[PDB]
Design a protein around this ligand. Sequence first.
Ligand SMILES: [Co+2]
Ligand SMILES: [Co+2]
Length: 194
Amino acid sequence: GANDYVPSPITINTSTLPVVVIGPADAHTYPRVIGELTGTSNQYIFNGGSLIALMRGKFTPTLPKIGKITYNFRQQSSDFDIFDTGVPGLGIIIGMAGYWPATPLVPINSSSIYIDPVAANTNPNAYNGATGSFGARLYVAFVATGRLPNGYVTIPTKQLGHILLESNRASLNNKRLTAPVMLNGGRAHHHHHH
Ligand SMILES: [Co+2]
Ligand SMILES: [Co+2]
């Protein structure tokens, strides 16, 4: 049916964090970015309806934010909210972008933001060109916010936030379809030396 779009999560994997080695120069200095996860993408965060639509995606982070940190993703520098994972000593920062490669990375540093098209953040009438899917790219870096144990650190799967689907077709907009933005759990490997 015309509006039978269905949500699909976008996920990024703890297991891709490189081994974290902290030497005497950066030991006990907080906060500090300790590594980036492999960036991911999902073309079909919303997909399925038979009638094409002009769509946009609004992201809302849902973890507690405890501070800010300046960072430039390897995948200018910007401020990012540091979100508390619930694991002592570990925070995360988030960036997101449109699925299409030319769209810019959007730092997560506010209560909610349109990740694509970014024009919608200053124009409430701005949507993506009409098509059958809405997708995104996801970027995450881990932050040492405090002492971490040596060895393997278990990181449970966490929901980072959700994307709300909006459209200039009211019947689709009124569904308030939402898709989870997920950090798949894993183990970080951490070595700390003085
Ligand atoms: Co120490
Ligand atoms: Co080791």
